Structures are given as C-alpha cells and as structure tokens.
GROMACS .gro file of C-alpha atoms in nm:
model
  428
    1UNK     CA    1  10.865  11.507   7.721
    2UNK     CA    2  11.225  11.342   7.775
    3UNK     CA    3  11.079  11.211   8.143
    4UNK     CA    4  11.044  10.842   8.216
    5UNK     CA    5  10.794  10.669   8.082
    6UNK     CA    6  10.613  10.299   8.105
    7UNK     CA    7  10.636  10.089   7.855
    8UNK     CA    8  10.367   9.748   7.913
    9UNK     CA    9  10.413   9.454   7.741
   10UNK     CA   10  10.265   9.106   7.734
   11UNK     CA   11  10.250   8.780   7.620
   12UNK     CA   12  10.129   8.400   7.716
   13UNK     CA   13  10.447   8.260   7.881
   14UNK     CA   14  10.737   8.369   8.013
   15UNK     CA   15  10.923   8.221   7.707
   16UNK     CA   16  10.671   8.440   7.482
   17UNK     CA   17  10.685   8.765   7.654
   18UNK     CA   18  11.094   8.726   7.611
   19UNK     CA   19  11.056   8.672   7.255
   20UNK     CA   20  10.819   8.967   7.237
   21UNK     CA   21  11.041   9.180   7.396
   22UNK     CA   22  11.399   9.078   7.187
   23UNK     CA   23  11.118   9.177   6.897
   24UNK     CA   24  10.985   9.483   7.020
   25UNK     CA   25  11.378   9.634   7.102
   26UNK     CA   26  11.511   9.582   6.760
   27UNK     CA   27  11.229   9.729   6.614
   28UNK     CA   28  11.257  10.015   6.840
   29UNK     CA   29  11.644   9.975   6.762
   30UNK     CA   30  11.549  10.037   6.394
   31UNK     CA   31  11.305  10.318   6.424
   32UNK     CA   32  11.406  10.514   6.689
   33UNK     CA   33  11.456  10.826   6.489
   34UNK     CA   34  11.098  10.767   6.373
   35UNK     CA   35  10.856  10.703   6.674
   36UNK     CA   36  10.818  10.923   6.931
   37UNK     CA   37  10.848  10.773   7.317
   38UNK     CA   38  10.494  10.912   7.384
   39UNK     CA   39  10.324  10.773   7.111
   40UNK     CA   40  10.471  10.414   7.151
   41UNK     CA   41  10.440  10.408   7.547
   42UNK     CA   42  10.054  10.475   7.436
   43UNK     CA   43  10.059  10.234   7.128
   44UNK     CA   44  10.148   9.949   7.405
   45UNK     CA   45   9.857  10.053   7.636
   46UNK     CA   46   9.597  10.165   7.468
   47UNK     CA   47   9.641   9.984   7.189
   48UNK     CA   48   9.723   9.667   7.226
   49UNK     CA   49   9.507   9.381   7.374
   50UNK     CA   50   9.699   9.291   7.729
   51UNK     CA   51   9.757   8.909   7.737
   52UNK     CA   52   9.797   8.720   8.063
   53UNK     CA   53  10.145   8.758   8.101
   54UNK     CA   54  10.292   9.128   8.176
   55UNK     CA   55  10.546   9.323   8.253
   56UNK     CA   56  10.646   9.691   8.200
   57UNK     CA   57  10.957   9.867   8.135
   58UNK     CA   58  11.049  10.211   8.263
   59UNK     CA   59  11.278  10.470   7.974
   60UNK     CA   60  11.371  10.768   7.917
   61UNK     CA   61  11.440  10.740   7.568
   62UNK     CA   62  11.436  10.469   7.323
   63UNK     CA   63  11.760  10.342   7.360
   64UNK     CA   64  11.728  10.345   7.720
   65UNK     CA   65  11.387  10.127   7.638
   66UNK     CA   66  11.621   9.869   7.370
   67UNK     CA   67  11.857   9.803   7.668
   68UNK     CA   68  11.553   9.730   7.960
   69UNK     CA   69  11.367   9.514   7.677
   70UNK     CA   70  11.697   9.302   7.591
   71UNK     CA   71  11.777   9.311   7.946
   72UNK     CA   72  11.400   9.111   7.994
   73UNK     CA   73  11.455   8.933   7.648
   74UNK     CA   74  11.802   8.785   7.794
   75UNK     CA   75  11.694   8.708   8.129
   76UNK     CA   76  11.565   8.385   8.340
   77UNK     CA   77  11.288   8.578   8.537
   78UNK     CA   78  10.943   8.379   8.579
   79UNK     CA   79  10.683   8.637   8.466
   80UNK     CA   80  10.328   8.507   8.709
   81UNK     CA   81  10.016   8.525   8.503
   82UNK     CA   82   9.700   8.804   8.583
   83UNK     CA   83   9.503   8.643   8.814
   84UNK     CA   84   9.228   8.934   8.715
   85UNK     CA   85   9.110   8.932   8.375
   86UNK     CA   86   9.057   9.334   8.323
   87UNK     CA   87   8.671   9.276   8.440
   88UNK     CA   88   8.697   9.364   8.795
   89UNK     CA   89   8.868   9.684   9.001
   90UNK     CA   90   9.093   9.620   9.287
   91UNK     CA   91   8.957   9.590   9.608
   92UNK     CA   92   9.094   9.821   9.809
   93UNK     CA   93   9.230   9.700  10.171
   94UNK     CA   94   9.226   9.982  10.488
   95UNK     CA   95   9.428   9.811  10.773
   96UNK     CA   96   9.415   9.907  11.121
   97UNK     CA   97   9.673  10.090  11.337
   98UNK     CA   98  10.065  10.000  11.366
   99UNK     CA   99  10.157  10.029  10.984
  100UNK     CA  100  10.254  10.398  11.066
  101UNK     CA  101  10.602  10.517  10.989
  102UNK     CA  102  10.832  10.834  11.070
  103UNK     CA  103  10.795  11.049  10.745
  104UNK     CA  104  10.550  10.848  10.554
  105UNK     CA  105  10.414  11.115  10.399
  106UNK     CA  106  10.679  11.327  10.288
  107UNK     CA  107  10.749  11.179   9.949
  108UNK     CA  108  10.385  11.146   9.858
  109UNK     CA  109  10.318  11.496   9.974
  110UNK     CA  110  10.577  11.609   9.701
  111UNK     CA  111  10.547  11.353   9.419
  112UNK     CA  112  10.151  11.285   9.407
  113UNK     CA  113   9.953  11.629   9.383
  114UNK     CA  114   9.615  11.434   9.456
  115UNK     CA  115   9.775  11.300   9.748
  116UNK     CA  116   9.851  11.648   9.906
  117UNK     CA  117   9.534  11.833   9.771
  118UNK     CA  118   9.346  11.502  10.010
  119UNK     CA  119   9.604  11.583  10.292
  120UNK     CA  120   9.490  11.983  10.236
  121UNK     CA  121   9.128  11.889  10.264
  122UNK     CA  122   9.200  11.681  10.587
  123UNK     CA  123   9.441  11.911  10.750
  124UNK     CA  124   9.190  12.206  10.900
  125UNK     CA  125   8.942  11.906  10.989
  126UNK     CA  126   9.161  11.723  11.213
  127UNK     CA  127   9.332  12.020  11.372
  128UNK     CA  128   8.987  12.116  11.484
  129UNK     CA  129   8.886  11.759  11.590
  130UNK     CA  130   9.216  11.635  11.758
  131UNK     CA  131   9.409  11.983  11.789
  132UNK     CA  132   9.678  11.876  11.578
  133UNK     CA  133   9.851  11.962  11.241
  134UNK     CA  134   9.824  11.591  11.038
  135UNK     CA  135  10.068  11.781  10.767
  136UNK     CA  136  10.329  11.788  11.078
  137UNK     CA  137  10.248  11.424  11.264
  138UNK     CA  138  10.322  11.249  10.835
  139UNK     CA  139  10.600  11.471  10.799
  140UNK     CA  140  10.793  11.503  11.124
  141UNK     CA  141  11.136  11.277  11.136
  142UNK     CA  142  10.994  11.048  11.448
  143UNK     CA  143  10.689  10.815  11.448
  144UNK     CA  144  10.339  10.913  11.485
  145UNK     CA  145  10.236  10.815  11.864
  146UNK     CA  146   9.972  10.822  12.103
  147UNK     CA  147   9.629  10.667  12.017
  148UNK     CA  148   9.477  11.029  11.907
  149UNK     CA  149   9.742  11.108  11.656
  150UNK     CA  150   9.811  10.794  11.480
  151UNK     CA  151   9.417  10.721  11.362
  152UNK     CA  152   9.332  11.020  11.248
  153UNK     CA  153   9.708  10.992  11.028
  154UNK     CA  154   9.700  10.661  10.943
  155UNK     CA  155   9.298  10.724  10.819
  156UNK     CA  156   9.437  11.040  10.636
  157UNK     CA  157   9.728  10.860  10.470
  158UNK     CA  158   9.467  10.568  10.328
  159UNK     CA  159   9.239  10.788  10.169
  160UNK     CA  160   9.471  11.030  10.011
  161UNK     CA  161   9.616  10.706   9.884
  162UNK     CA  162   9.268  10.616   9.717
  163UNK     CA  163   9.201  10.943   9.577
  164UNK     CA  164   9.504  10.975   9.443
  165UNK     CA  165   9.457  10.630   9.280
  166UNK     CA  166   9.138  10.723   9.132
  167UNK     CA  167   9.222  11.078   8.975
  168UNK     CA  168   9.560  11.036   8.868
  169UNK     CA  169   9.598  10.689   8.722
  170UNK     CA  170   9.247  10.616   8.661
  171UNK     CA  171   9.197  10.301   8.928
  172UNK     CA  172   8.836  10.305   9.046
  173UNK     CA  173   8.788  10.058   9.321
  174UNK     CA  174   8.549   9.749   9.217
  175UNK     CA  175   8.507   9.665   9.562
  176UNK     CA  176   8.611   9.833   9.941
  177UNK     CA  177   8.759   9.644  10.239
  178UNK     CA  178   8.827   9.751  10.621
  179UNK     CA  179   8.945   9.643  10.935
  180UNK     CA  180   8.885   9.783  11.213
  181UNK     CA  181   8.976  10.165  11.193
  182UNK     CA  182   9.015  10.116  10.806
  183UNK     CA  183   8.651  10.072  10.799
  184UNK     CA  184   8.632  10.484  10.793
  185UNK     CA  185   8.865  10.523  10.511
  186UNK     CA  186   8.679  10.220  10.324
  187UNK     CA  187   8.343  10.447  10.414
  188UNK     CA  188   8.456  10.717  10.237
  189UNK     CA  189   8.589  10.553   9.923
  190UNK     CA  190   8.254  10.381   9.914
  191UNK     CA  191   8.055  10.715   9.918
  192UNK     CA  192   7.928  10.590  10.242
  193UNK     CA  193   8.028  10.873  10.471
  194UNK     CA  194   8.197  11.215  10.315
  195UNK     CA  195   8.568  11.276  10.389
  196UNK     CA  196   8.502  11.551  10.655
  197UNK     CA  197   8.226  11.303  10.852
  198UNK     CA  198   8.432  10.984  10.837
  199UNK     CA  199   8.784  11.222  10.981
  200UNK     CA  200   8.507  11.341  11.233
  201UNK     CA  201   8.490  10.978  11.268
  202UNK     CA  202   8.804  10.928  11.369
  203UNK     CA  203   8.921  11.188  11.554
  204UNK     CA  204   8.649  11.143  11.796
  205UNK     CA  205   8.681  10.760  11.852
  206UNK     CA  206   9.046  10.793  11.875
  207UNK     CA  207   9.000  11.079  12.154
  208UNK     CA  208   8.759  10.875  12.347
  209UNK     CA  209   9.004  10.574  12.326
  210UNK     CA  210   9.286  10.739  12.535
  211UNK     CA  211   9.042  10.747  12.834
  212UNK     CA  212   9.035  10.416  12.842
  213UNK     CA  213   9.483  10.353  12.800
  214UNK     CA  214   9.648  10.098  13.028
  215UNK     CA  215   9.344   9.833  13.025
  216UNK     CA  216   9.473   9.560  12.858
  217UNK     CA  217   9.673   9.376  12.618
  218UNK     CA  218   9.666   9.189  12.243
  219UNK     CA  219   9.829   8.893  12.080
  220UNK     CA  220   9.778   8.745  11.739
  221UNK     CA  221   9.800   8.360  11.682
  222UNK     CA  222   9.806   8.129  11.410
  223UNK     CA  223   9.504   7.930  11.517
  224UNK     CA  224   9.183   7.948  11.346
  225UNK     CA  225   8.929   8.159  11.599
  226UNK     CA  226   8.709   7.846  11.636
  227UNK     CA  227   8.960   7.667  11.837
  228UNK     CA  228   9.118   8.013  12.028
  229UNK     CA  229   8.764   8.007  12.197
  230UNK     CA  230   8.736   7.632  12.211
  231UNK     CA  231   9.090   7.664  12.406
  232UNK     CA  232   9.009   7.997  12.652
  233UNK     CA  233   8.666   7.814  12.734
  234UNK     CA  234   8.861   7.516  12.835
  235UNK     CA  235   9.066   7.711  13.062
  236UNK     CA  236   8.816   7.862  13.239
  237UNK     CA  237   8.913   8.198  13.041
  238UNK     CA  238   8.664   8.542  13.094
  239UNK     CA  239   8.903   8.801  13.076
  240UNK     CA  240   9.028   8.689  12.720
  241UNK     CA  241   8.831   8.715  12.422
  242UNK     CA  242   8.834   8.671  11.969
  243UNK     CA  243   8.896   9.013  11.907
  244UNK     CA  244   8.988   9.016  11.567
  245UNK     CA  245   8.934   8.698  11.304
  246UNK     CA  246   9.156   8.818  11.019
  247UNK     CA  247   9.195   8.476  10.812
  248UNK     CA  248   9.077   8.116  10.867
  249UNK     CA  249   9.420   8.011  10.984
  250UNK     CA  250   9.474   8.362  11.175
  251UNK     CA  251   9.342   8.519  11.508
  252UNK     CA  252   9.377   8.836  11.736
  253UNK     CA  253   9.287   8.776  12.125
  254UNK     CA  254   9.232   9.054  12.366
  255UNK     CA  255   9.167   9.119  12.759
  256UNK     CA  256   9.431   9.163  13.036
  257UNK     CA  257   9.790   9.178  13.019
  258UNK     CA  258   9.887   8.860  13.190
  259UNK     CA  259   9.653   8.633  13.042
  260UNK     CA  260   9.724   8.746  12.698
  261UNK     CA  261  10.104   8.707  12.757
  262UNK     CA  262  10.044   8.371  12.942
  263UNK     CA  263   9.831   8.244  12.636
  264UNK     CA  264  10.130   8.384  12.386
  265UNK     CA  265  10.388   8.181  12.566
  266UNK     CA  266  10.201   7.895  12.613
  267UNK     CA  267  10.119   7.840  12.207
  268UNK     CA  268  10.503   7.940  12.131
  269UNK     CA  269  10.586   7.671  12.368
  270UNK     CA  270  10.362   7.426  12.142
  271UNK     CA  271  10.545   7.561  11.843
  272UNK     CA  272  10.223   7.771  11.740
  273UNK     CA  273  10.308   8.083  11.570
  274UNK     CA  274  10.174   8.373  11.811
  275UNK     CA  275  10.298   8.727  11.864
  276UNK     CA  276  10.218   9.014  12.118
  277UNK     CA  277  10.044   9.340  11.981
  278UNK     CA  278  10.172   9.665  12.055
  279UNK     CA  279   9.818   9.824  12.211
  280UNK     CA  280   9.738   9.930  12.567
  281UNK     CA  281   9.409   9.894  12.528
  282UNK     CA  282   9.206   9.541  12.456
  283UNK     CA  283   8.980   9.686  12.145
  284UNK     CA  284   8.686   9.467  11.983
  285UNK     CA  285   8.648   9.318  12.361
  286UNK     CA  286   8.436   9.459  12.681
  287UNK     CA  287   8.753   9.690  12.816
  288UNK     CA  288   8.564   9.945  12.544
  289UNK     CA  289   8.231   9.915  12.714
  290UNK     CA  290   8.284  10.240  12.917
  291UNK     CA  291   8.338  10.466  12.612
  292UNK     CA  292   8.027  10.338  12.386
  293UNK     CA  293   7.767  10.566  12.490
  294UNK     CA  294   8.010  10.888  12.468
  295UNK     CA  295   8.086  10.741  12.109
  296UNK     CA  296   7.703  10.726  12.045
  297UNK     CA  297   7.655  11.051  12.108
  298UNK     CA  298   7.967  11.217  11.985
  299UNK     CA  299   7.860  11.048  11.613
  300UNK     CA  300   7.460  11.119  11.628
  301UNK     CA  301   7.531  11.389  11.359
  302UNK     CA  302   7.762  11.187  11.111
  303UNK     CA  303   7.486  11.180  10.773
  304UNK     CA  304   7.535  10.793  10.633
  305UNK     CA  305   7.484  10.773  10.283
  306UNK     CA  306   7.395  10.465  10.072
  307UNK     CA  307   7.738  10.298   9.898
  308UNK     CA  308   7.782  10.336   9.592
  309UNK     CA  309   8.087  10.072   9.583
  310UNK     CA  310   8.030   9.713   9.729
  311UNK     CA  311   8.148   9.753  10.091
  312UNK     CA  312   8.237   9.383  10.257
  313UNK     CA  313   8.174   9.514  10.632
  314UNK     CA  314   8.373   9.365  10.940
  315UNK     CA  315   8.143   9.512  11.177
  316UNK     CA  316   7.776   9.346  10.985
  317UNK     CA  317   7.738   9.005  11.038
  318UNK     CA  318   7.670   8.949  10.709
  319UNK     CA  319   7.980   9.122  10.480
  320UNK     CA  320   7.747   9.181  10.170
  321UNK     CA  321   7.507   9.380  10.332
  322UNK     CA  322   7.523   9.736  10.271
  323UNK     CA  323   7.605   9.951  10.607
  324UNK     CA  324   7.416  10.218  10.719
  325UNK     CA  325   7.708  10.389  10.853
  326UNK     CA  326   7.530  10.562  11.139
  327UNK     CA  327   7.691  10.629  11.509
  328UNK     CA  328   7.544  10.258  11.603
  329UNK     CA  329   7.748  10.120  11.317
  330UNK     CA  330   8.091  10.296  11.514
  331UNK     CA  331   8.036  10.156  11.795
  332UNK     CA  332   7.960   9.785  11.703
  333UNK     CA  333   8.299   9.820  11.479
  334UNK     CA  334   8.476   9.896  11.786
  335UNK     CA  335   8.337   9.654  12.020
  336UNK     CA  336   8.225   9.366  11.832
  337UNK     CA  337   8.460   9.128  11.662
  338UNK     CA  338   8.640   9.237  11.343
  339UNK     CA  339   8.508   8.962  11.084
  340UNK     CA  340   8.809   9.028  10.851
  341UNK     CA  341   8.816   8.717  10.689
  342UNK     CA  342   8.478   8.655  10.631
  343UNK     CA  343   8.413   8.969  10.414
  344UNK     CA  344   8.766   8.897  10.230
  345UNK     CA  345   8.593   8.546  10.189
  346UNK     CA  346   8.265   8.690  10.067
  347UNK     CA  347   8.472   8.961   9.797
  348UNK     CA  348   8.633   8.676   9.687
  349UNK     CA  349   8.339   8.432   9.625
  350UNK     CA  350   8.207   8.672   9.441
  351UNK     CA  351   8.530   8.681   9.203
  352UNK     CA  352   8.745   8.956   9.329
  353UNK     CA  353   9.103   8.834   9.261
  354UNK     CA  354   9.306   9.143   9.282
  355UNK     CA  355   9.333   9.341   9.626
  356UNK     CA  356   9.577   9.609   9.701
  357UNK     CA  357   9.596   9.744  10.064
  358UNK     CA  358   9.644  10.136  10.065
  359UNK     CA  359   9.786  10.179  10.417
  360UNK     CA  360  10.158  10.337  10.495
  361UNK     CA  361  10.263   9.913  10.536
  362UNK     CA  362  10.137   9.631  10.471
  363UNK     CA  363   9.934   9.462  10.776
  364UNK     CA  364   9.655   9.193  10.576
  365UNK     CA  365   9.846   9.063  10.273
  366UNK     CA  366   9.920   8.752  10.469
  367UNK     CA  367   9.539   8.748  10.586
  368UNK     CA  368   9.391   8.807  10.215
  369UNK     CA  369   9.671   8.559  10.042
  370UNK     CA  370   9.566   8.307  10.292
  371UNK     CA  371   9.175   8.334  10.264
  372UNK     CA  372   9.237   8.276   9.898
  373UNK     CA  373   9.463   7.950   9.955
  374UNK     CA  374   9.165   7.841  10.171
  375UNK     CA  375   8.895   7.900   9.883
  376UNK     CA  376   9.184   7.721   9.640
  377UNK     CA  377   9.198   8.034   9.425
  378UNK     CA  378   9.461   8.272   9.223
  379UNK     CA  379   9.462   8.597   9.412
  380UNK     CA  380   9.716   8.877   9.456
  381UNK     CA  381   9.732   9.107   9.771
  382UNK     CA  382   9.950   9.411   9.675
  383UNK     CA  383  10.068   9.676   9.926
  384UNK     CA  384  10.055  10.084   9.808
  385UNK     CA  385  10.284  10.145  10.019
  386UNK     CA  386  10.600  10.004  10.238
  387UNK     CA  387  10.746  10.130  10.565
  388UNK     CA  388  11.100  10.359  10.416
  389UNK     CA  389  11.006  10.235  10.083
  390UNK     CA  390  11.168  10.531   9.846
  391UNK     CA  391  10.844  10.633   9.583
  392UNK     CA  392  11.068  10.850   9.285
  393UNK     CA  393  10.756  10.843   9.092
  394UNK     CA  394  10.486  10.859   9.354
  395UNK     CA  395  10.222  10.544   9.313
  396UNK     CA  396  10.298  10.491   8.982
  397UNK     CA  397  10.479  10.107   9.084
  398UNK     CA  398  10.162  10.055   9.249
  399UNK     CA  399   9.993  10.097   8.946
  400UNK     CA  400  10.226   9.891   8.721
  401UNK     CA  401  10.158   9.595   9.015
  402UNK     CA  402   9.751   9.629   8.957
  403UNK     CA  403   9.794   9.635   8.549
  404UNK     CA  404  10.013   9.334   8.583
  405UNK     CA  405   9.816   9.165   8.814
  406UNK     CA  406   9.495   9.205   8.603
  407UNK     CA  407   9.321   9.456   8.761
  408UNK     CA  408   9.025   9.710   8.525
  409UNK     CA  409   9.172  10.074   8.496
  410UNK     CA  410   9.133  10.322   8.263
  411UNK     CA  411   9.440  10.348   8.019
  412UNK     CA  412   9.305  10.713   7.928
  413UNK     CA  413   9.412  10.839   8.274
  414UNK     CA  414   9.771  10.758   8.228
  415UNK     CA  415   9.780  10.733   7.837
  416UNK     CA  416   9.557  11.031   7.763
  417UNK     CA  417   9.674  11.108   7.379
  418UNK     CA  418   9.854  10.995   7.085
  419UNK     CA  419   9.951  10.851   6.771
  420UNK     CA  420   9.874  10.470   6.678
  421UNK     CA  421  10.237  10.361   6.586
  422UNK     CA  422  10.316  10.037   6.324
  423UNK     CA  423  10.516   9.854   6.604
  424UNK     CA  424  10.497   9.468   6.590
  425UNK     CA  425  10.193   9.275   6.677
  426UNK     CA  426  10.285   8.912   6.749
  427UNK     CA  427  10.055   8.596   6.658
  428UNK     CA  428   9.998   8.345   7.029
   0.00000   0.00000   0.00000
C-alpha cells in the first residue's frame, strides 16, 4: 500500500543513530526503485536487533523516508536511551476521574476498529446500568458531567484503550496499575473481573455516589502523606483526612469544604505547592460511609476471577498480593486510602521501567516519574492519550513511544509479512 508507514531505527548515541540514518537514506536514495516500502519498514523491525537508542520515521514513499532520515541525520535532537530492555510489557496506568474531555472519543471511534468494537460491547451494558448511551456522552461536543456519566465513560474509554493496544499493535501488558476508579479498568485487563462485571462495577458505584453530592471537598499537596497527617493531627483536625497517597512527595486530603480550602491556602501561603480538586464529594474518607452497605449488596453477584497479569492493588495493603475482586474489595477501594505510590513503588522494585497511562489525559505521570526519582531509577511514564490531542493514525504514536522507550511487543502484530531486504547493518 502507498499509506504511511513506520520506519524504526536505532543506534548507541545520538551521534550514532545520525550516522545510521545519513546511511540508511542514501541507500534508500540508491535503491528506491528496488525495495518495496513494506518490506523495508519490516526489514527495520523485525529484523534488525533494536539498540538502546531509537527513533522512528513516518513515509509514504521512499523519498518521502530519504528526506525524514536526512532531516534526523542533519539535526541537533538528543535521542534518550530505552530505559526497558525489550524484557518487560508496559504497565498499564488507569487514573481516576477529571481526565475526561468533550469528544474524546470521536477520533478513536473512527481510526481504531478495536477501540469501537470495546465501545460496542460496553454500550448496551451501561445504558442498562446508568440509562445512558456511552457512544453519545464520548462523542457529544460538551464535557462528560455528573458523577454517573463520567465513570462509567472514563472506565469505558481506558479499556477500549487496552484492548485496542493488545489486538492491534500487539502490546500485552507485563504488569496493571489503578487508582481509584481505574482499579475496574485495571481488573479487567488483568482477567480479574470480565468487561460486563467490572462496567457493572461502575455504573453502580458511580450511581450510589450521587446520593451522597454536596458533602465535601478535595485538595492535593506536595507534601509527603506522613507529614499531611502529622500536620492535621497537630491542628486538632477530624474532619480532614489522607485520601489519596499518589507519590512520596505527593498527597490528596479530603473532608469538608472549609477545612480543605483553609488547609490549601495555608500551604500556598508557605510556598507549598497545593491545589483544590474539582469533587463534591470527599471519596477514600468517612463522607462514603453511608453508601457502603448499598455498594455491598449491589456487587454480591460480580464473579472475581484469579489475575492472570500482576495487579499492584491501591486498595490491598500489600500491592503484590493478588485481589480477590469481590464486592468487599469495592468498597475498601472506595473508602480506604488509595496507596498509589506504594504499588507504583512495588512494580518498580520489581523492574518495571516503562508505564504508559491509558486514560483520555494524563493524571499520574508526575506521580509514577516521581516514585522512580525516589527509588533513583530510569523510568518513563507515557500518556495514550491527551486532552484535544489530534490521533490521524489512532494509537499508533503511542506505540512508537513504548518501542522507543523499551517496552516487549510483538513486531508480528504491526509487521505481520515480508521480504528480508539487503539494507545496511552498521558495526557499534
């Protein structure tokens, strides 16, 4: 085909991968009339050994690919090593709510056929739950709102981003990550719940949730969470608790309105980096006490399953155990604390370097980039998706961003056929 096409290529430095691509376009120069684009696109990938240093360029044809490989070849750009070495899957990252956007799924819907056969699958399941179309709420030209609509498409949007991930360009996950409500998408990925019980899920925890709207307030802070509570204990503080501990330098608080905006003002008057959240409701606190034994019951028929995927759990107080995702398991992940960090921490001790967070934007790259500062390692935290970020080519960057960060995938997925071409192979 004449469509656009990836081209990888990689080398040991910066310096090297320039000279390997000033080599690569005028042998392409020279044989264009020779190779076909779909044989050296897979000659690149499939076979060639990737060296720590990648990039990838995107071509039509092979002059287009001559230009974009003298255009890296005459360059100043600092190419960052893998910090993965092809040994591990990406962990995938499920945020919470906020990242939701007006039309977030419009461009996925039409460029990533996995993406809309998940949204298909969802759609009948969540108009029966929640009463609404989740085709409409991703599509329509204003912003999902109102606790009960944005889970359920926020929850739908992360795991059609997963399975289309998986079937089309061949990423399994190594490892699974949530927070919060991302713990049901991260359930499903993991084989822990099935797509239809985790949307069950929720739909229903979101529903309860609005019974309980106008309670409180949130605020995030740049304080590790052993000091927050060393700070609301000397204040005398009840009302105010550690909702949410999402890296060792980072914090969520939660409880009523005016304490949490008092205790915002107060650390941005000591030049301590805190921020209101945009939530009624004080979540992973007691306000949700009155809702737990509706939850209870609306999940006693939700069948766990045993993962299949390591799943670092936010809810367990130890991340490596294995959750039995039962209707207990809901309601400890909405009221007790959301141990983010500590089951990024445990992923990453046991040497996951390479997480990508499949929400519609990007709310824990900070939090995973600065759990791996903390452990003094090489990580990257990668974000499927930005809010009214144009995707031409449907995940396919995202992909490109996992390859060159190091992450295992299967080259067959993308690559699936072709001819080994005699293109240049150059000594390190």
């Amino acid at each position: 085909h004449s469509s656009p096409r990836l081209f990888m290529l990689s080398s040991t430095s910066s310096d090297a991968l320039r000279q390997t691509a000033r080599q690569l376009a005028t042998w392409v120069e020279e044989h264009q009339d020779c190779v076909a684009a779909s044989d050296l696109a897979y000659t690149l990938a499939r076979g060639r050994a990737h060296r720590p240093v990648r990039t990838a360029v995107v071509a039509a044809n092979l002059p287009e690919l001559v230009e974009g490989l003298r255009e890296v070849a005459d360059g100043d750009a600092l190419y960052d090593a893998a910090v993965g070495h092809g040994d591990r899957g990406p962990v995938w990252v499920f945020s919470g709510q906020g990242s939701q956007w007006a039309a977030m799924g419009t461009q996925l819907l039409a460029s990533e056929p996995v993406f809309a056969a998940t949204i298909a699958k969802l759609e009948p399941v969540i108009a029966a739950e929640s009463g609404f179309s989740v085709t409409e709420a991703i599509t329509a030209q204003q912003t999902v709102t109102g606790i009960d609509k944005v889970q359920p498409a926020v929850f739908a949007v992360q795991v059609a981003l997963a399975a289309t991930m998986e079937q089309t360009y061949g990423v399994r996950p190594g490892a699974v990550v949530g927070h919060s409500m991302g713990e049901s998408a991260a359930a499903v990925v993991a084989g822990a719940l099935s797509l239809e019980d985790a949307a069950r899920v929720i739909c229903r925890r979101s529903k309860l949730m609005t019974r309980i709207a106008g309670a409180g307030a949130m605020g995030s802070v740049e304080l590790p969470a052993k000091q927050v509570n060393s700070e609301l204990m000397a204040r005398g503080i009840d009302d105010v608790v550690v909702s949410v501990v999402a890296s060792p330098q980072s914090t969520v608080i939660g409880g009523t309105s005016d304490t949490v905006r008092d205790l915002i003002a107060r650390w941005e008057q000591r030049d301590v980096m805190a921020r209101e959240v945009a939530v009624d409701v004080a979540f992973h606190s007691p306000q949700v006490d009155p809702i737990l034994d509706d939850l209870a019951a609306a999940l006693a028929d939700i069948a766990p399953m045993t993962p299949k995927v390591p799943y670092y759990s936010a809810t367990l107080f130890d991340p490596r155990e294995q959750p039995v995702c039962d209707g207990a398991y809901w309601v400890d992940n909405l009221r007790n604390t959301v141990q983010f960090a500590a089951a990024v921490q445990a992923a990453m001790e046991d040497g996951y370097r390479v997480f990508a967070e499949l929400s519609p934007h990007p709310l824990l790259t900070h939090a995973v980039e600065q759990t791996g500062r903390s452990l003094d390692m090489s990580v990257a935290a990668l974000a499927g998706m930005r809010r009214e970020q144009p995707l031409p080519h449907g995940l396919r960057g995202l992909l490109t961003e996992l390859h060159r960060a190091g992450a295992a995938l299967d080259y067959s997925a993308l690559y699936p056929a072709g001819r080994l071409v005699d293109a240049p192979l150059p000594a390190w």
